[PDB]
Design a protein around this nucleic acid. Structure first.
Lengths: 191, 141, 53, 104, 141, 75, 142
RNA sequence: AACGAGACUCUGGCAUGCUAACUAGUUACGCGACCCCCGAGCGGUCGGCGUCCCCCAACUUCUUAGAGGGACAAGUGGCGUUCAGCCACCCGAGAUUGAGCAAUAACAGGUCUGUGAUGCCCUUAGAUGUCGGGGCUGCACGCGCGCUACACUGACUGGCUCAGCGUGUGCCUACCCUACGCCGGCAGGCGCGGGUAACCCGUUGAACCCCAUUCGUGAUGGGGAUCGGGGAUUGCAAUUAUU
């Protein structure tokens, strides 16, 4: 508090969680603030140990895929500093509040699975863990920007920051909020 | 200051400028026909490359105890793409670096010192630290 | 014999052999060894090496 | 005269080596020649990694062999006579010894 | 007496021996200021203990560090781990227990292996595949 | 791939729009100028450098692979 | 600004004013990117602007500095051809003359009827390469 | 009761304890010398930056290698027949870091082209045992292991900055690793010097990474296949292009 750490420009207070079903699986402000999203980390060796490391750190981790960006985590932090910068200018909100909203609006609430009966495909609708919601929601919105910048004049920074605006709002003009409702649309059917 | 106390990306780009201002250096004939290292695919983007490389040369002599033409090349060498074949390391040109060191030595900021190898002249060490404080005075480190 | 009975071999495969059977190709040159890999194994225990890892 | 004489030991067996080093440090200390203890040098690895099959067939397997030599050296400064006296005594196992004329 | 206590840091082969000697200010690493050390994107990280603890634990020391080993990243964690640990040891030994006990509690709150060394190191390649656990493709028929 | 073409020299309308986009835009990058106009990305790079010399826009961040510009900090 | 001109024709190939000067010139055969960044600097002009921004006075000088490279002190080793063979000099060959020169050397190696011309005429690889699993195309299988 | 299992051996993670170091370092000054006011101050003096200078200085944290110690489900709380154990937690480095070695019995598995290991059969002077030059690379197809790419999370050009396992002439019948100086755009040539190696090459100043220019979504500068012309090095010889 009298030694409160920012991101080097952003407050980690004034960050809400608008679920009681996803608070304490978002890590952003209990003492999870850090100036960077790089650490040695422990993300393994016990099942309940992933939820104890920041959301901002998780974000940096999950956007380094496709076989040529692995082992280039340092380049990834470059993309995150521009992302938040653009988000703050663009709408005016503290860009962490943007990200938390974006996660909460994108998480699917029911999903389907397989079951083998009579040698024919039957499907069953099931619910999801809070830990599952977070894992899915971080994956989905990152997939949008990764796809978009794959032959465009637009850079990966621009694409990613745009995608967090439309996710944080209920706009439904994003790769995340599209696919979220697609899954639920299946789950209704084979319920 | 010591050159360590200031930024070094900034140091060289001002040390190069110092030389080019003062009419310093003797420059080879070849300067628009030069690949500037074996592994490079194209000629320099800059015509002032002789001045630029002399900056980086003189900086290293301050730091390490100084060594011959071989070691200078080893500092400069990088990765060589081989097309379909996978990459390898290589060490660049020699005759460019041998002219760089000899041009500096012409101003007597370098000299073949003890144990057969170049070392930076005490007059040379003076001039580095002279503009080293100008960098910190100018902007502010 | 006369002026033909031989052709210079002083580099490459035909100018080295091995000391336990004079076999070529599969052999270990390293450390001054000159032993063919099939036979090297059988004299491995005999002062030389021992397995440890 | 008193010459700085360096006795290098080298072997393949760490037990057999070390006790013979202790003996040579003893014989020196007995006559108070102001010897320096062992300076144990980095152990070096000879490796041979080759096929286990004669005439390839079956899964590809290899086998790491290693021999570890050991070097260590004791520095003496004393007359060269009494050195060659104490050197030649109390050595039984296969362990090599190398006597040096002088050192700086 | 002559106040000097030495520590080291580790992270996957990268030693950084940091002596803490009485003084005031003037912390360095490799005879350079730690206000720039050159990836400088992870610049906030090595500064992190100094910034978080304030300048009032660094109100009577010069700490200087020599390094070797590791890559660009692992060096940053080594130097950070060493200067942090240096500070703790210095207060335990020439000041008092309750001096360092506070400071120990502060660091271990936001622990990031600031008082311990990462055990993890690389595992050996065994044949029949690249890497230490991956295997070449296996074709049936 | 698609077929598209961009303008590699300036015209009247490009310059005039360039002066009037400034108070209306919070973000200005060369990429966004590529889309709103029909203009090449390196042309658009230098076009924004001109505006900064006038003081119409303000730099806020810089990189090798990106440059960001803002309005006049008037909201 | 600078609306003056765009796409133009020079010797034997049409060169756009759309692209940067050096890279624009490369389309002409016998001139690579490496060959052009030299010749522009001997001509002492910018390479930091478009090819449509050059004037007629300037481009007239370009072709002269190109086609007499030894006389403007570009080294001999930096040319396409050193002692062509049976012509006796260092030479630099450009677009439509390149093809004519090339077709001669093919004809020559079937004139003497070396191994080379036979491989050329049969449509098989000249250099040491396997053709067992290479080339394909193909079809007609058993 | 026995074998295999574990035990064992090697390897990795823990010691400011022990043993001792010009073929390993550090610290401390003495410094004298260079350097800049670079910091307090003034430029003196005091301090900072490294090198030569360092010692019959002090030390062994860092490097090295030997003996030892440390880890046990030990402690606590649950759970279990309250047994064998299991789960969580404290302490702290969690009892599980990775390999080596590996049974009985079997296969008509592979290898007579490793063997001066070997049975039998065959051939043996017009020889299946030697020289010359040619082939094992020959291409309508098919299949397998890989390598490089399809770009902007990029390429290109400058600038900044970090390692580890090894290896090396004195060997077979003849050969090594290379610093340094000079000449050449480059490949390379040439003159001198060290190293039997914790001593010399080499404080192995490696790459991705990092920072700033240029290119602009275009089969484009992405890609470098194919192919023309020319220069070097190895060898007795390079043609089907050794590199």
């Amino acid at each position: 508090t009298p030694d409160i750490k920012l991101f080097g420009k952003w407050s980690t207070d004034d960050v809400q969680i608008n679920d009681i079903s996803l608070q304490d699986y978002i890590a952003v402000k209990e003492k999870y603030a850090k100036y960077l999203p790089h650490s040695a980390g422990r993300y393994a060796a016990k099942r309940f140990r992933k939820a104890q490391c920041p959301i901002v750190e998780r974000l940096t981790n999950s956007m380094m895929m496709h076989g040529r960006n692995n082992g280039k985590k340092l380049m990834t932090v470059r993309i995150v500093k521009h992302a938040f910068e653009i988000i703050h200018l663009l709408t005016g909100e503290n860009p962490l509040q943007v990200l938390v909203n974006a996660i909460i609006n994108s998480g699917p609430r029911e999903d389907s699975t397989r079951i083998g009966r009579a040698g024919t495909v039957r499907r069953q609708a099931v619910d999801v863990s809070p830990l599952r919601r977070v894992n899915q929601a971080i994956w989905l919105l990152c997939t949008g920007a990764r796809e978009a910048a794959f032959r465009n004049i637009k850079t990966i920074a621009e694409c990613l920051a745009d995608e967090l605006i439309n996710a944080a709002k209920g706009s439904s003009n994003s790769y995340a909020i599209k696919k979220k409702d697609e899954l639920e649309r299946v789950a209704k059917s084979n319920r | 200051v010591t050159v360590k106390d200031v930024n070094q990306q900034e140091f060289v780009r001002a040390l190069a400028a110092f030389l080019k201002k003062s009419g310093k250096l003797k420059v080879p004939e070849w300067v628009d026909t030069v690949k500037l290292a074996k592994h490079k695919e194209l000629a320099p983007y800059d015509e002032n490359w002789f001045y630029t490389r002399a900056a980086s040369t003189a900086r290293h002599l301050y730091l390490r105890g100084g060594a011959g033409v071989g070691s200078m090349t080893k500092i400069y060498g990088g990765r060589q793409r081989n097309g379909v074949m996978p990459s390898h390391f290589s060490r660049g040109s020699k005759s460019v670096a041998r002219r760089v060191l000899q041009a500096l030595e012409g101003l007597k900021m370098v000299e073949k010192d003890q144990d057969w190898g170049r070392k930076l002249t005490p007059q040379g060490q003076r001039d580095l630290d002279r503009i080293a404080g100008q960098v910190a005075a100018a902007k502010k480190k | 014999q006369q002026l033909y009975w031989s052709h210079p071999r002083k580099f490459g495969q035909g100018s080295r052999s091995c000391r336990v059977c004079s076999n070529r190709h599969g052999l270990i040159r390293k450390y001054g060894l000159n032993m063919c890999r099939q036979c090297f194994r059988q004299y491995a225990k005999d002062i030389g090496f021992i397995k440890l890892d | 005269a008193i010459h700085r004489i360096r006795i290098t030991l080298t072997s393949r067996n760490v037990k057999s080596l070390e006790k013979v080093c202790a003996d040579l440090i003893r014989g020196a200390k007995e006559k108070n020649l102001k010897v320096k203890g062992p300076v144990r040098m980095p152990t070096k690895t000879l490796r041979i990694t080759t096929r286990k099959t004669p005439c390839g067939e079956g899964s590809k397997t290899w086998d790491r062999f290693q021999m570890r030599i050991h070097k260590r050296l004791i520095d003496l400064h004393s007359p060269s006579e009494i050195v060659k006296q104490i050197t030649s005594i109390s050595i039984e196992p296969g362990v090599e010894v190398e006597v040096t004329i002088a050192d700086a | 007496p002559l106040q000097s206590v030495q520590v080291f840091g580790r992270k996957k082969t990268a030693t950084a021996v940091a002596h803490c000697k009485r003084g005031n200010g003037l912390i360095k690493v490799n005879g350079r200021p730690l206000e720039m050390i050159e990836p400088r994107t992870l610049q906030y990280k090595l500064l992190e203990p100094v910034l978080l603890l304030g300048k009032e634990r660094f109100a009577g020391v010069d700490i200087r560090v020599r390094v070797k080993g590791g890559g660009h990243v692992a060096q940053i964690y080594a130097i950070r781990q060493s200067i942090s640990k240096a500070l703790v040891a210095y207060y335990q030994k020439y000041v008092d227990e309750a001096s360092k006990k506070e400071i120990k509690d502060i660091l271990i709150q936001y622990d990031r292996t600031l008082l311990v060394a990462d055990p993890r190191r690389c595992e050996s390649k065994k044949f029949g595949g690249p890497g230490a656990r991956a295997r070449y493709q296996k074709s049936y028929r | 791939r698609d077929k598209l073409n961009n303008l590699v020299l300036f015209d009247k309308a490009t310059y005039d729009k360039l002066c009037k986009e400034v108070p209306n835009y919070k973000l200005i990058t060369p990429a966004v100028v590529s889309e709103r106009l029909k203009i090449r990305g390196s042309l658009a790079r230098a076009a924004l450098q001109e505006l900064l010399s006038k003081g119409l826009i303000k730099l806020v961040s810089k990189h090798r692979a990106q440059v960001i510009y803002t309005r006049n900090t008037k909201g | 600004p600078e609306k003056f001109q765009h796409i133009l024709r020079v010797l034997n190939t049409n060169i756009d004013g759309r692209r940067k000067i050096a890279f624009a010139i490369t389309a002409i055969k016998g001139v690579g990117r490496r060959y052009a960044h030299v010749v522009l600097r001997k001509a002492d002009i910018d390479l930091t602007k478009r090819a449509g921004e050059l004037t007629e006075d300037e481009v007239e000088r370009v072709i002269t500095i190109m086609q007499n490279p030894r006389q403007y002190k570009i080294p001999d080793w930096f040319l396409n051809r050193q002692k062509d063979v049976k012509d006796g000099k260092y030479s630099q060959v450009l677009a439509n003359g390149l093809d004519n020169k090339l077709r001669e050397d093919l004809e020559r190696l079937k004139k003497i009827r070396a191994h080379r011309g036979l491989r050329h005429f049969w449509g098989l690889r000249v250099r040491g390469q396997h053709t067992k699993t290479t080339g394909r195309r193909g079809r007609t299988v058993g």
